[PDB]
Amino acid sequence: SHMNQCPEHSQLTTGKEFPEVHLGQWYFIAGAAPTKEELATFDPVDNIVFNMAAGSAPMQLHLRATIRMKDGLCVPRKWIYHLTEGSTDLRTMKTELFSSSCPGGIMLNETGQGYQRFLLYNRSPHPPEKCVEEFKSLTSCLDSKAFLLTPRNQEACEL
Ligand SMILES: CCCCCCCCCCCCCC(=O)OC[C@@H](O)CO
């Protein structure tokens, strides 16, 4: 009894390197979900660039992003996250962080009311295609077979 596991995938754990090691910029590379409808929100997107910062209060992080839409428009977004000590989970729902096969990579798992999806980010806007192939392969194995790759043909919007 064998042949029933998915590729190796480790959740990020706490040590006190988290989260300073993750701050700075990131690019949205690809998403996977049980169905297309959890990825629908990303259909008109060319690229998204993000910046993560230390919050203002104690266990807090400022996220900024600018979405470059396929039509060329730029849409700014801002969110605040709350870490829990001992945990790498982000509270805005919960986001689990996982290590990635790609150097400079990171994968998120978003859980919520009757929806779920995996989202790949990297420091580089153009990581190796292998990295993306391994993420598709891993997520398909976890039953998120619907896949979207951001095209990243246009320049990042300012952030
Ligand atoms: C401090 C450790 C966290 C580092 C994670 C860096 C990845 C930053 C992106 C987080 C995106 C989550 C927001 C979200 O729901 O995505 C929807 C779109 O607007 C972008 O994917």
Ligand 1 centroid to Cα of residue 71, in Å, is: 22
117 is in an annotated binding site: yes
Write the single-letter amino acid at 8: E
Residue 10 makes CB contacts below 8 A (sequence gap 6+) with: 98, 99
* Dist CA 75 CA 91 (whole Å): 23
Sign of CA dihedral 97, 105, 41, 55: positive
How far, CA to CA in Å, does 39 sit from each of 57, 71, 84, 97, 99? 32, 18, 28, 19, 21
Q: Cis peptide before 151, with omega less than 30 degrees from 0?
A: no
Q: How many residues does the chain have?
A: 159
How far, CA to CA in Å, does 34 sit from each of 18, 140, 149? 30, 9, 15
Ligand 1 centroid to Cα of residue 3, in Å, is: 33
110 is in an annotated binding site: yes
Q: Beta-strand (E) ranges in 18-113?
A: 24-33, 45-54, 60-69, 74-82, 94-98, 105-112
Closest by CA position to 47, among listed 129, 158, 145, 150: 150
Q: Domains of the chain (ranges plus CATH)? A: 1-159 (2.40.128.20)
The answer, yes or no, to whether any atom of ligand 1 lies below 6 A from the CB of 119, is: yes
Radius of gyration of the chain (CA): 16
Residue 132 makes CB contacts below 8 A (sequence gap 6+) with: 29, 30, 120, 149
| 121, 122, 149: residue to mutate for ligand 1 pocket, most atoms within 8 A of CB | 121
